[PDB]
Coordinates of N, CA and C in Angstrom, one line a residue:
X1 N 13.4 15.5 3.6 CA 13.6 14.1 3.2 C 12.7 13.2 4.0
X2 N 12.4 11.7 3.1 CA 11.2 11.0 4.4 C 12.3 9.8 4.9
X3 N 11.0 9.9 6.5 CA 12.4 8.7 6.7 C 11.5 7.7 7.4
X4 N 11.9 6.5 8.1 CA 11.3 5.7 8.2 C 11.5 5.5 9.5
X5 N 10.1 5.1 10.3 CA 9.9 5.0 11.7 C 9.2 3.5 12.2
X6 N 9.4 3.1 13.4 CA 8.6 1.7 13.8 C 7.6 1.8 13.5
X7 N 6.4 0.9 13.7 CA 5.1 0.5 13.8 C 5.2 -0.7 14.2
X8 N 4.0 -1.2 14.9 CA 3.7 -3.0 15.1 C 2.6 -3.3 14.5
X9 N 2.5 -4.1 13.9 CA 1.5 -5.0 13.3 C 0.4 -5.2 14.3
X10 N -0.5 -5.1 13.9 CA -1.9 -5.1 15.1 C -2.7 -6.2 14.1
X11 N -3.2 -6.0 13.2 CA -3.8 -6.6 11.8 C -4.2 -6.5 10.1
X12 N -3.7 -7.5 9.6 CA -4.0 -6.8 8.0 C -5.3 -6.0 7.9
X13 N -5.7 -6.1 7.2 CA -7.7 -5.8 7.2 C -8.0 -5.7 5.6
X14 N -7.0 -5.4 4.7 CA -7.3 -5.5 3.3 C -5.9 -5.7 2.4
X15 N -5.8 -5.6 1.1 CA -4.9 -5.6 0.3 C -4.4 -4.4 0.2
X16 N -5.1 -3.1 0.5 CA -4.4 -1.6 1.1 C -4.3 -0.8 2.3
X17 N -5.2 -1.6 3.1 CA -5.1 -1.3 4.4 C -4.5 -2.4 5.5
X18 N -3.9 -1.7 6.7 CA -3.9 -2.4 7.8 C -3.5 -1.9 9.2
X19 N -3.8 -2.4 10.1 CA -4.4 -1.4 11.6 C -2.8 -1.7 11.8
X20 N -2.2 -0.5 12.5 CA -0.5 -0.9 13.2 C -1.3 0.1 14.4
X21 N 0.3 -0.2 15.4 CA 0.3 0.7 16.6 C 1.6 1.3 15.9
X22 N 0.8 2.7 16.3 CA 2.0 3.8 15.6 C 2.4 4.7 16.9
X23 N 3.5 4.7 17.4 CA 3.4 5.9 18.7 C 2.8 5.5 19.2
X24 N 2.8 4.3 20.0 CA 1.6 4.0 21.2 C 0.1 4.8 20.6
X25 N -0.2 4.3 19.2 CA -1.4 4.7 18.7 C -1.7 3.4 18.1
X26 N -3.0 3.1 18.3 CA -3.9 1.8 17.4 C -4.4 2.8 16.4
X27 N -4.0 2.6 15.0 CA -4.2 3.5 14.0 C -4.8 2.3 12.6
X28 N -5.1 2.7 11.4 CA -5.3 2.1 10.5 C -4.4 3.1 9.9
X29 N -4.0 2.2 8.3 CA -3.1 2.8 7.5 C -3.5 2.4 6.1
X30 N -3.4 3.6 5.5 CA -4.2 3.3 4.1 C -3.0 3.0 3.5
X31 N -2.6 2.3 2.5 CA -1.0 2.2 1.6 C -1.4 3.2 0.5
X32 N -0.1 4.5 0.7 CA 0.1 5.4 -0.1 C 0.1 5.0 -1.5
X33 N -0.7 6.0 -2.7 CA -0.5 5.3 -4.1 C -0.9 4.1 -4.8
X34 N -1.5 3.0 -4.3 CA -1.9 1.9 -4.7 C -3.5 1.9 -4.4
X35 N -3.8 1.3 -5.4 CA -5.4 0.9 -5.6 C -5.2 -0.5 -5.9
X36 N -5.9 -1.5 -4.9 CA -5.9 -3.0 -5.2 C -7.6 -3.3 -5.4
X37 N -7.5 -4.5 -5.7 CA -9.2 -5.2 -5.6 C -9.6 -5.1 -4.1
X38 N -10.8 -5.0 -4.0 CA -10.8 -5.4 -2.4 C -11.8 -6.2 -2.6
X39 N -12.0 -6.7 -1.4 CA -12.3 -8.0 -0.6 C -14.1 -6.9 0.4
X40 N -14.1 -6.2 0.5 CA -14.7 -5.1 0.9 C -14.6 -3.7 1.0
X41 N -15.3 -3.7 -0.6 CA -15.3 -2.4 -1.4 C -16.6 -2.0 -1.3
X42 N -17.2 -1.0 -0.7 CA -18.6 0.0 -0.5 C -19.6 -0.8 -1.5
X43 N -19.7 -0.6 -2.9 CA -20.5 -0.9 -3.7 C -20.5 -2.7 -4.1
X44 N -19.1 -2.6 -5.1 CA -18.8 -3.7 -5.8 C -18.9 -5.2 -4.6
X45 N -18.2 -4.9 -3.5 CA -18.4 -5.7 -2.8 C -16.5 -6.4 -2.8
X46 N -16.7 -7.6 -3.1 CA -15.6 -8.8 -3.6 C -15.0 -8.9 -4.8
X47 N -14.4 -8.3 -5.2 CA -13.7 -7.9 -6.4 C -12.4 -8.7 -6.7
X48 N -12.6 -9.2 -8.2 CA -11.6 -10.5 -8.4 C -10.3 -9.8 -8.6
X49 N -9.3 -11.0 -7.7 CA -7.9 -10.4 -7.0 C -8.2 -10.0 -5.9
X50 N -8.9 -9.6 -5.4 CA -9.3 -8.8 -4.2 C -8.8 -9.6 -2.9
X51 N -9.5 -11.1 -2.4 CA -8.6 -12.1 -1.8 C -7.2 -12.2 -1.5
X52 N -6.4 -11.9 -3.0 CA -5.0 -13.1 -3.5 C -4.8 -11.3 -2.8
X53 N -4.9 -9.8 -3.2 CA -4.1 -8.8 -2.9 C -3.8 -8.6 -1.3
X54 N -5.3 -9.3 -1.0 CA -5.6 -9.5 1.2 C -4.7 -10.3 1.3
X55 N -4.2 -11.6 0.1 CA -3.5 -12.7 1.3 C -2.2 -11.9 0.8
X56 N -1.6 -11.4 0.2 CA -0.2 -11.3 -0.3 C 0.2 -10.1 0.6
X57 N -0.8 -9.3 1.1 CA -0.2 -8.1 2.1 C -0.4 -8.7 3.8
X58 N -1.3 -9.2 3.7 CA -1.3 -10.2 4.7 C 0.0 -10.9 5.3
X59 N 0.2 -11.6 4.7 CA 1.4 -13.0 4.6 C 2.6 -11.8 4.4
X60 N 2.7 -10.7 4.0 CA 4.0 -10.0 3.6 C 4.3 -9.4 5.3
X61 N 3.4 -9.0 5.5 CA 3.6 -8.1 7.2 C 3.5 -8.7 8.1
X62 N 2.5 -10.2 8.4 CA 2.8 -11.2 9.4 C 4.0 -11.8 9.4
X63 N 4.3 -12.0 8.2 CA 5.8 -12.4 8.7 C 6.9 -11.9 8.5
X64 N 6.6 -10.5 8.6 CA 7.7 -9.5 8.6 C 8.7 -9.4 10.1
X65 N 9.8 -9.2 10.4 CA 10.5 -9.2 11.5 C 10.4 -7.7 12.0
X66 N 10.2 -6.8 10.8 CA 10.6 -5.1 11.4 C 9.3 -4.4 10.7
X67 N 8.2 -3.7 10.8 CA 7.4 -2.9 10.4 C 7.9 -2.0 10.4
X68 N 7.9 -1.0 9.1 CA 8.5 0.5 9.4 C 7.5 1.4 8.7
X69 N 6.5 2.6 8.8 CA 5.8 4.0 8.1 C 7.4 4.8 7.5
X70 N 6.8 5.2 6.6 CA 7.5 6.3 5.8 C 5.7 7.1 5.6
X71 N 5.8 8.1 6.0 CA 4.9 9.0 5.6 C 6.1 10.0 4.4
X72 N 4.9 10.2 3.7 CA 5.0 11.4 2.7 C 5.4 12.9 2.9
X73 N 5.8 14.0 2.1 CA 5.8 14.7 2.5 C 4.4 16.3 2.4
X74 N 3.1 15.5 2.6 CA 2.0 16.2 2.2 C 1.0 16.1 3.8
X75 N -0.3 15.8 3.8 CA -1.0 15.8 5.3 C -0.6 13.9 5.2
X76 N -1.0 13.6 6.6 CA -0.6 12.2 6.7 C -1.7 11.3 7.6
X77 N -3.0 12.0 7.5 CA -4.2 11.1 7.7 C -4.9 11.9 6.8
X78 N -6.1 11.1 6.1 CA -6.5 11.1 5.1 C -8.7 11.4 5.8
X79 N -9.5 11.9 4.9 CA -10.7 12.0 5.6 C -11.4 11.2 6.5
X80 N -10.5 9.9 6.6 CA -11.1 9.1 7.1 C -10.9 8.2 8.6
X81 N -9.4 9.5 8.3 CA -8.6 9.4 9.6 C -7.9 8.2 9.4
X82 N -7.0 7.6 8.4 CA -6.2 6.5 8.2 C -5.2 7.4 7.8
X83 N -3.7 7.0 8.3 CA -2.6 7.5 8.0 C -2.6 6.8 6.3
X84 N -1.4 8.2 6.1 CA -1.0 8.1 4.3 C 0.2 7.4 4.6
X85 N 0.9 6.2 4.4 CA 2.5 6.1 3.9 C 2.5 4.7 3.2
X86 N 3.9 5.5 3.1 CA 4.1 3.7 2.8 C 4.3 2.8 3.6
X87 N 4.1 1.9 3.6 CA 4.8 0.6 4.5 C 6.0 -0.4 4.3
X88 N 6.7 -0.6 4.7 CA 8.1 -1.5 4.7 C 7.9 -2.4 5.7
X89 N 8.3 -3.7 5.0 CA 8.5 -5.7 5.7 C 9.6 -5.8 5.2
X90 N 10.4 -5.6 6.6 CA 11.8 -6.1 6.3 C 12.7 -5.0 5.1
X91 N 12.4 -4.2 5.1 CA 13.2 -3.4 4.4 C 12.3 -3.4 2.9
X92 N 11.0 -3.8 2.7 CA 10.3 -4.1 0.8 C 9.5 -3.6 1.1
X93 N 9.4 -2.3 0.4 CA 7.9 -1.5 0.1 C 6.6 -2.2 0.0
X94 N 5.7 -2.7 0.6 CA 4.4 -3.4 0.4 C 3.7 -3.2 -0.8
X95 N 3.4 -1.6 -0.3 CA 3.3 -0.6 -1.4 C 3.5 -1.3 -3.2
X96 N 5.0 -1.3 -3.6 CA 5.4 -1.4 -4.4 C 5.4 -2.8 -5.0
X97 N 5.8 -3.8 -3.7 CA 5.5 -5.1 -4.0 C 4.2 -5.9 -4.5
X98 N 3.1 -4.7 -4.0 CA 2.0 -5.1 -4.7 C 1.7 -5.2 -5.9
X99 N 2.1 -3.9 -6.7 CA 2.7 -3.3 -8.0 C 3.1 -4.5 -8.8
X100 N 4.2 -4.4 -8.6 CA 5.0 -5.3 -9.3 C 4.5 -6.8 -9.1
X101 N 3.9 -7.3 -8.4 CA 2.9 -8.7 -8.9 C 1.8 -8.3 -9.7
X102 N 1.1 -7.2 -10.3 CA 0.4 -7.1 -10.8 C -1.0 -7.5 -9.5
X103 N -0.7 -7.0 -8.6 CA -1.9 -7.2 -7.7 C -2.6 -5.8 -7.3
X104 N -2.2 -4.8 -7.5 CA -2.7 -3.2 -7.4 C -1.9 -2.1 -9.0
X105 N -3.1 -1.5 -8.9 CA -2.8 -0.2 -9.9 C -2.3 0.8 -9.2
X106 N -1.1 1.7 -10.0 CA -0.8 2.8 -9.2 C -1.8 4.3 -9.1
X107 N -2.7 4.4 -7.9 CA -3.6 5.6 -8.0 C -3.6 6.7 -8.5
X108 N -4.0 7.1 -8.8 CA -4.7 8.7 -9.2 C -4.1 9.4 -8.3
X109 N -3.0 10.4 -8.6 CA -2.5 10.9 -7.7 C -2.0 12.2 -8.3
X110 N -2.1 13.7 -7.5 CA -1.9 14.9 -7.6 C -1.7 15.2 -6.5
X111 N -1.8 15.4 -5.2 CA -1.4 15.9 -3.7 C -0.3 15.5 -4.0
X112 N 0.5 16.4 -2.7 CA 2.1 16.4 -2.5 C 2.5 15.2 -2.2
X113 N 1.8 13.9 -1.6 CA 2.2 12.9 -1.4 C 2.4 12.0 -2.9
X114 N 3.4 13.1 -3.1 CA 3.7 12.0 -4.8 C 5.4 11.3 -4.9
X115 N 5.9 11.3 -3.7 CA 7.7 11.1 -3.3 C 7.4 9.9 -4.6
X116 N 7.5 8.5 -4.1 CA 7.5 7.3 -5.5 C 6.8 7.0 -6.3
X117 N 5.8 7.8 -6.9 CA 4.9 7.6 -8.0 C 5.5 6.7 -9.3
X118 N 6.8 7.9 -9.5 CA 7.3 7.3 -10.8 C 8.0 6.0 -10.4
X119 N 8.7 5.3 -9.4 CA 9.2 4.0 -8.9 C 8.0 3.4 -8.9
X120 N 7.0 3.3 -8.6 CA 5.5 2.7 -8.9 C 5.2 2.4 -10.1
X121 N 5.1 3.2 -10.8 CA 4.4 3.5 -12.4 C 5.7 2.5 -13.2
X122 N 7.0 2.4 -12.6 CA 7.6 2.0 -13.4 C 7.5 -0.1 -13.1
X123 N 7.1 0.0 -11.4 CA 7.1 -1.3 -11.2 C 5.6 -2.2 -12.1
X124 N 4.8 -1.2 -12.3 CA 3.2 -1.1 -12.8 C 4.0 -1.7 -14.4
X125 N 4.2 -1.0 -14.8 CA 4.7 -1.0 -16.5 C 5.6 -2.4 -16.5
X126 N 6.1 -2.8 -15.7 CA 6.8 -4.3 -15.8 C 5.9 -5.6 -15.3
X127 N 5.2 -5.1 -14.5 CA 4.0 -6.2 -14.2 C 2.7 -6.1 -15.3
X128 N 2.5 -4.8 -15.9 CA 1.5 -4.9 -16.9 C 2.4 -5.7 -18.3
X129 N 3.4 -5.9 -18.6 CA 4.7 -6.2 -19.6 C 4.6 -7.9 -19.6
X130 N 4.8 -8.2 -18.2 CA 4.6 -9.4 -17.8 C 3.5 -9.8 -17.8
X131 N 2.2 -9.4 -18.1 CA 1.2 -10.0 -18.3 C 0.4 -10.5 -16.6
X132 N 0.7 -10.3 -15.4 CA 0.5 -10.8 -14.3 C -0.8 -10.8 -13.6
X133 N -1.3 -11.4 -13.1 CA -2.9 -11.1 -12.8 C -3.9 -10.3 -12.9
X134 N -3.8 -9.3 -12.3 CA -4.5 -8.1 -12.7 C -4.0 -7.9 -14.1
X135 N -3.3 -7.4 -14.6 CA -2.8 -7.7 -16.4 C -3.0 -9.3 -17.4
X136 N -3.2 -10.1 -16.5 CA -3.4 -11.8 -17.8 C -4.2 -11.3 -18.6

C-alpha cells in the first residue's frame, strides 16, 4: 500500500515539477502521471497554458500548510534523478488538481507507477467534458 510522507517546499520550478526537501534531501520532484505545458520545455520553449499550469501549482504548494510525497509503487527517481510521486497541499492531489482544471494531460503511462491512472483519466474526461483550457 502507498502512504504518505512530509516534504518542505523549497520552490515551484514548473507546472510538473518542484524542488522539496525530502529526508533532509534538497531533491526535485517530477509529478507522477501528468504532462502540463511548460514554461521551459527543451525544444518548444513556452508553451500556451504553460505559465497559468506554473502559476496554479505554484500558488497550490506556497500556500499549502502540509506538503506530503506518496511515491508509487515502481523505482521512485526517474533518469534524471527527480523523484516519481505524487504530491499533496493540504490533503489535494496537485497531481490530479491539475487534471481536473484542464491544465495537464494524463501521461503515457505503462511502468508500475500506475496506482491513480484511472482517478486521473477520469478527472481528465471531466475537464475535457467541461471544455476547460487546455480543452476550450
Amino acid at each position: 500500500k502507498l502512504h504518505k510522507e512530509p516534504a518542505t517546499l523549497i520552490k515551484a520550478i514548473d507546472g510538473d515539477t518542484v524542488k522539496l526537501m525530502y529526508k533532509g534531501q534538497p531533491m526535485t520532484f517530477r509529478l507522477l502521471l501528468v504532462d502540463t505545458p511548460e514554461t521551459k520545455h527543451p525544444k518548444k520553449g513556452v508553451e500556451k497554458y504553460g505559465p497559468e499550469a506554473s502559476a496554479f501549482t505554484k500558488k497550490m504548494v506556497e500556500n499549502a500548510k502540509k506538503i506530503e510525497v506518496e511515491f508509487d509503487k515502481g523505482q521512485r527517481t526517474d533518469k534524471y534523478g527527480r523523484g516519481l510521486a505524487y504530491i499533496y497541499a493540504d490533503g489535494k492531489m496537485v497531481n490530479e488538481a491539475l487534471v481536473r482544471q484542464g491544465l495537464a494531460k494524463v501521461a503515457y503511462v505503462y511502468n508500475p507507477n500506475n496506482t491513480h491512472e484511472q482517478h486521473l483519466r477520469k478527472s481528465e474526461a471531466q475537464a475535457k467534458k467541461e471544455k476547460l483550457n487546455i480543452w476550450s
